[PDB]
Amino acid sequence: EPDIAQLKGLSPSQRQAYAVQLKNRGNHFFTAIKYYQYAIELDPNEPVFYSNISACYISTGDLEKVIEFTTKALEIKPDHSKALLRRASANESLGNFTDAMFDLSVLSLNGDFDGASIEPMLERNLNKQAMKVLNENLSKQVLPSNTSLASFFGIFDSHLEVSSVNTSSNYDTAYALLSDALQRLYSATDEGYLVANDLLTKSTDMYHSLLSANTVDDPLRENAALALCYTGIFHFLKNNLLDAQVLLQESINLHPTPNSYIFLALTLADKENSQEFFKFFQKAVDLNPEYPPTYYHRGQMYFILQDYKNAKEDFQKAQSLNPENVYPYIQLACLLYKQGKFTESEAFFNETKLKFPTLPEVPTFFAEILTDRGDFDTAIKQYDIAKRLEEVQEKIHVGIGPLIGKATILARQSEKFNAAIKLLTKACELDPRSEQAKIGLAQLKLQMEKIDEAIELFEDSAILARTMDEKLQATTFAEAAKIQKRLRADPIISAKME
């Protein structure tokens, strides 16, 4: 109704004075947008007009307009508390979680606001942003670390496995390759795992071809089942659960074996419903009640489930079937510890050490328990002993586990900080597929303000991580650090961060 174009043609002072009057009218209509817009048309240099309009759009629910006009207020007064809080809210609603965390971060730098009163919204936006990025990445061929692989295959009898290839077929022209793949697998070396993965795939292809012919042997079917079994579990280790189940069932259909059932159970495992897991292991036991790895793997599930009695019996059975394998001893000692029986656990570890004096598995798992007890001094010494034993072994036993355990004690103890960096850097070099090593190193990079390097280690770690929870954890660290990068990139912000 007032003629704004006409008022626009008046002197700056008149326009400024008329604009206050227009804004005043707007404030009344508060009982509005039209009058604030009029005010802005006349004097675009008053943040009050923009902040007032943005309050209108909150009322009307126009989120995009709230962003537009809070931003206009903030261009003039970048620490306008009301505008920062409104823009963060609208941004959170629109799914712009990074922009919400940036404005909430700037807000906290205002000493008028208790950091603790803003942290819950920073945290909520961070978790939303991590889940957004994780889901995007999931929506749009790498092995676990050599340390993890040595651990996974540690229970099996290397010589038994390699010898399980049948040389009596009249049709099997492929078995030398399967024999080679298993020899390389059970070498427990860096080269071994890489080689095993490619050679098991190639073997499986060759068996798929031989099985397609009109003439096939039982010895042949058994070798094909064995290739499929190990290729299946490699799929599982590569986080390809679907192709894992397919090949493992193919294997079982050809020639049911304990390993085939153990590997299938592992692939489909879920502690929150256990029934199928235990049926698969009972069938594995049926196929060979004297096979130690069946009982050991079932004991681990009972352990996870806190069925300590059944876990003890299964580990004892694995132990009695193959007393020369250190793993059932370790788990028995760990079982004692988790039941609050540290003194018995410690005695069991000491007896195990006498039986296996050169194996770093013993001090490594014992150091883990001491760390859990807060006995950081003694844990360091046990990690030191494990590290020295590991370095001199021919095979991988505990891999970089000791370097990680020691660095982690040193890093949070706090001089030693450089010692922690050197340990974790060595660990990353020795076992480049270890997400544990990358994440530990990234945490220290953050503390010395190498944020770009942190981000890269975190993101690489999420791609490496196997479980959804571990992928989400590493994504969360990456997304948090990207916010840090963004804040540090503004020198005014960065000075206030000091």
CA atoms within 13 A on the CB side of 430: 21
The number of angstroms, rounded, from the C-alpha of 158 to the middle of its chain's C-alpha atoms is 30
Identify which range of 139-147, 258-266, 273-281, 387-395 contacts Cl ion by CB under 5 A: 387-395
User: To the nearest whole angstrom, how small is the minimum distance from the Cβ of residue 166 to Cl ion?
Assistant: 38
Nearer to Cl ion, 200 or 424 (CB): 424
Q: Does 2 bind Cl ion (CB under 5 A)?
A: yes
Q: Write the binding mask 85 to 124 for Cl ion: x where contact by CB under 5 A, - elsewhere.
A: ----------------------------------------
Q: Which of 21, 27, 127, 274 binds Cl ion (CB under 5 A)?
A: 127
Nearer to Cl ion, 74 or 332 (CB): 74
Q: Which of 402, 454, 458, 483 binds Cl ion (CB under 5 A)?
A: 402
State the amino acid at position 414 in one-letter form: S
Q: Does 431 bind Cl ion (CB under 5 A)?
A: no
Q: Does 21 bind Cl ion (CB under 5 A)?
A: no
Q: Does 131 bind Cl ion (CB under 5 A)?
A: yes
Identify which range of 157-165, 382-390, 412-420, 454-462 contacts Cl ion by CB under 5 A: 382-390
Q: Does 23 bind Cl ion (CB under 5 A)?
A: no
User: To the nearest whole angstrom, how small is the minimum distance from the Cβ of residue 190 to Cl ion?
Assistant: 13
Q: Which of 390, 435, 459, 479 binds Cl ion (CB under 5 A)?
A: 390
294 closest CA partner among 268, 320, 324, 330: 320
Nearer to Cl ion, 265 or 389 (CB): 389
Identify which range of 37-45, 145-153, 154-162, 169-177 contacts Cl ion by CB under 5 A: 37-45
Q: Which of 74, 83, 122, 130 binds Cl ion (CB under 5 A)?
A: 130
Number of residues that bind Cl ion (CB under 5 A): 13
Nearer to Cl ion, 298 or 471 (CB): 471
Q: Which of 42, 46, 227, 474 binds Cl ion (CB under 5 A)?
A: 46
Q: Which of 86, 297, 298, 387 binds Cl ion (CB under 5 A)?
A: 387
User: To the nearest whole angstrom, how small is the minimum distance from the Cβ of residue 337 to Cl ion?
Assistant: 22
Nearer to Cl ion, 78 or 323 (CB): 78
Q: Does 49 bind Cl ion (CB under 5 A)?
A: yes
Structural tokens at position 21: 């009057």
Cβ atoms of 361 and 398 within 8 Å: the answer is yes
Q: For the chain, what's the residue count?
A: 498
User: To the nearest whole angstrom, how small is the minimum distance from the Cβ of residue 1 to Cl ion?
Assistant: 9
Q: Which of 133, 162, 403, 437 binds Cl ion (CB under 5 A)?
A: 403
Nearer to Cl ion, 348 or 365 (CB): 365
Nearer to Cl ion, 222 or 390 (CB): 390
Site for Cl ion, rule CB under 5 A: 2, 40, 44, 46, 49, 127, 130-131, 387, 390, 400, 402-403
